[PDB]
Design a binder for this molecule. Structure first.
Ligand code: PRO
Length: 710
């Protein structure tokens, strides 16, 4: 029969909970405890069968070698100036973590400023956030170990790259902002909690507070500047205005792009920062987002979505704060989303728009908002930018599906502006001209036209014979734009596959209306959109059900897992990374309470009724037809993923193996791989990234029996 046997997993049939009258059984509830011998044994047993399966066919080694070769290309970030020096991140190619360099001039020799690689043998300690003092002489940086969201903030004196004694603990989802007097830095921290705080715990994160750390002191001396004891879920991030006069507090609750905005005129403090600041509650509700751009005196420019779904720029004068008095600096565009805006060279605004899922970059006048210059870009994404108000030049990084980055530079002091190539890297082995990217719009179930990028070798016959890899996310106002992925291109070139990315609802591709189209009561829209994408690829002849692989991560993991339950006949392989699988209990762990803005919460009868319909953990069912089985599935998670606690995947795989894996007609494998010293994904070292993609494509290869193409 099969080559391996699924592990014995105890079913606690007494675990029954009542959700507003509906009895729900959770037989693997015990997997919620990561510290138990039972759970440890479970993980060990699952990995024991997954690893040999993935490593059996030599195609994995072929893929790993090719990935190690092709991924070995110089990787730079935009240069950015702080004080009298320039900084930039650079990875020579295969370093586990990118290194931060410093140079005293653009033509000067660069030296290593911060090398995270020497902090661990395996590169599992990574930089997570940083902040330079206004004068650029001091530097704060966060470090996370094993992929955890938890951070320890450390400090350095820039001149000489001197280590300082200051260390801040209990930092997570924190701001980092220095006051311009150079005395200290604002940051967020959570209260002491029982148990561990290393990324392996599941404990809910509440009561985050805003503190001020004076350089040269112990964290126990830190000043508490803002706290919301009556609102446990609020999170207040601080930033200083460009002139350093005001502390702007952005309070968020949940993941919607909205925030309260309070301010503190530092000059009005009785005796400096000594306790809870004299906050003026400018915007004291969660009805809209207000993202600070710059200010001229009391006139503050904010990027907002207040009655502007595609976003716009408005000016609020603190001296005449009523909404009826706000000035619209740059009106909302009928369809293009204003993604972000930066102020540079005092009176210039850099605006980045998303037009049909492709970026555009424009320069505008701060005083009038009028368009001054269009920066030419090919089809793709702007994924990096540098240029603060006092800077006189900008750098920006562009990427696409077929090419790594091109970093451009533009000296804004020249009357005739014209960006110039500053850095460009070419991957030897992947000739971009051999492939093509197309964008099509397909109708979903309800008729809504959804965009989808498709990348493939030029001149293929659309006869349905090609394996395909369809990616999707769908939620949280996140736009899935073009990105350079050598791993995916190896699938195209060496596995003869077709790549597709569906910009389903719930994302931010078409503004807040697109986001609202895939949340709460309408979450099913996401799944319908994605299923329709698969149907489009099949109908048009790009692939066939048995040769189609779907992939998503986190909320995207929820996407592909649900699609496997709803339309098992439509896919051949499903790879769900760090997915949210238990939609009834997600809100109980770590930062999960924040996702209720997209999903709702089971505590509500109304929400429960939406959730129970698509929750992956609660919708595993044998297909009715004798000729339909579940697709091959691979769940990927890690023991320090404190963003989406691994229990989601643990309970889901147990359920799949028991309900579906035991069926005689099920021949496709249902596996999970739980990595160690890793988390959700941010900061994952190069070595691990390579192993992961090798596991993914090896799985696809074995399940669909795809031959390697040298
Ligand atoms: O998608 C992610 O990365 C997690 C889970 C949904 C919200 N944030």
């Amino acid at each position: 029969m099969l080559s391996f046997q699924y592990p014995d997993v105890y079913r606690d049939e007494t675990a029954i909970q009542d959700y507003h009258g509906h009895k729900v059984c959770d037989p693997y509830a015990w997997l919620e405890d990561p510290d138990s011998e039972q759970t440890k044994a479970f993980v060990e047993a699952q990995n024991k069968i997954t690893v040999p399966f993935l490593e059996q066919c030599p195609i994995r080694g072929l893929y790993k070698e090719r990935m190690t070769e092709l991924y070995d290309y110089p990787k730079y970030s935009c240069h950015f100036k702080k004080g009298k020096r320039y900084f930039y991140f650079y990875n020579t190619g295969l370093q586990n973590q990118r290194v931060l360099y410093v140079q005293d001039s653009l033509e000067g020799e660069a030296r290593v400023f911060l090398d995270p690689n020497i902090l661990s043998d395996d590169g599992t300690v990574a930089l997570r956030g940083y902040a330079f003092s206004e004068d650029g002489e001091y530097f704060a940086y966060g470090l996370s170990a094993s992929g955890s969201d938890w951070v320890t903030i450390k400090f350095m004196k820039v001149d000489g790259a001197k280590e300082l004694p200051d260390v801040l603990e209990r930092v997570k989802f924190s701001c980092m902002a220095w006051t311009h007097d150079g005395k200290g830095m604002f940051y967020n921290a959570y209260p002491q909690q029982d148990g561990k705080s290393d990324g392996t715990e599941t404990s809910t994160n509440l009561h985050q507070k805003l503190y001020y750390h004076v350089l040269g002191t112990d964290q126990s001396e830190d000043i508490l500047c803002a706290e919301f004891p009556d609102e446990p879920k609020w999170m207040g991030g601080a930033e200083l205005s460009d002139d350093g006069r005001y502390v702007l507090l952005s309070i968020r609750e949940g993941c919607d792009p909205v925030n309260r905005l309070w301010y503190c005129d530092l000059q009005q403090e009785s005796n400096g920062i000594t306790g809870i600041l004299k906050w003026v509650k400018l915007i004291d509700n969660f009805e809209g987002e207000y993202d600070y751009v710059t200010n001229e005196g009391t006139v503050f420019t904010f990027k907002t979505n207040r009655h502007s779904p595609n976003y716009r720029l408005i000016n609020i004068d603190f001296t005449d704060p009523e909404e009826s008095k706000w000035k619209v600096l740059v009106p909302e565009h009928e369809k293009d989303v204003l993604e972000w805006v930066a102020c540079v060279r005092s009176n210039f605004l850099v605006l980045c728009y998303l037009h049909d899922v492709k970026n555009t970059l424009q320069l505008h006048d701060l005083a009038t908002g009028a368009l001054l210059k269009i920066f030419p870009l090919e089809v793709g994404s702007v994924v990096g930018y540098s240029g603060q108000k006092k800077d006189t030049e900008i750098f920006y990084q562009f990427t696409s599906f077929l090419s790594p980055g091109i970093i451009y530079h533009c000296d804004l002091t020249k009357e005739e502006l014209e960006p110039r190539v500053f850095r460009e890297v070419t991957v030897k082995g992947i000739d971009a001209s051999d492939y093509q990217t197309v964008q099509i719009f397909y109708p979903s179930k309800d008729g809504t036209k959804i965009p989808m990028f498709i990348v493939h070798k030029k001149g293929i016959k659309l006869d349905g014979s090609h394996p395909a890899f369809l990616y999707g996310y769908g939620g949280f106002n996140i736009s899935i734009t073009p990105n350079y992925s050598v791993s995916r291109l190896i699938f195209v070139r060496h596995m003869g596959g077709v790549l597709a990315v569906a910009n389903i609802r719930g994302g931010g591709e078409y503004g807040e209306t697109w986001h609202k189209g895939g949340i709460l009561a309408n979450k099913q829209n996401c799944f319908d959109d994605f299923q329709c994408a698969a149907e489009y690829l099949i109908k048009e002849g790009y692939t066939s059900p048995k040769r189609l692989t779907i992939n998503g991560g986190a909320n995207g993991g929820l996407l592909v897992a649900t699609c496997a339950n709803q339309r098992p006949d439509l896919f051949g392989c499903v790879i769900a990374q760090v997915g949210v699988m238990d939609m009834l209990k997600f809100h109980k762990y770590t930062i999960g309470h924040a996702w209720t803005t997209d999903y709702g919460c089971s505590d509500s009868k109304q929400h429960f009724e939406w959730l129970i319909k698509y929750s992956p953990l609660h919708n595993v069912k044998l297909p009715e037809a004798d000729d339909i089985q579940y697709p091959s599935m691979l769940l990927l998670t890690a023991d320090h993923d404190d963003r989406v606690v691994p229990l989601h995947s643990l309970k889901f795989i147990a359920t799949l193996q028991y309900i579906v894996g035991r069926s005689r007609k099920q021949n496709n494998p249902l596996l999970i791989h739980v990595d160690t010293k890793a988390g959700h994904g941010a900061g994952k070292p190069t070595a691990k990234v390579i192993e992961e993609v090798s596991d993914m494509f090896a799985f696809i290869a074995r399940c669909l029996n795809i031959d390697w193409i040298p």
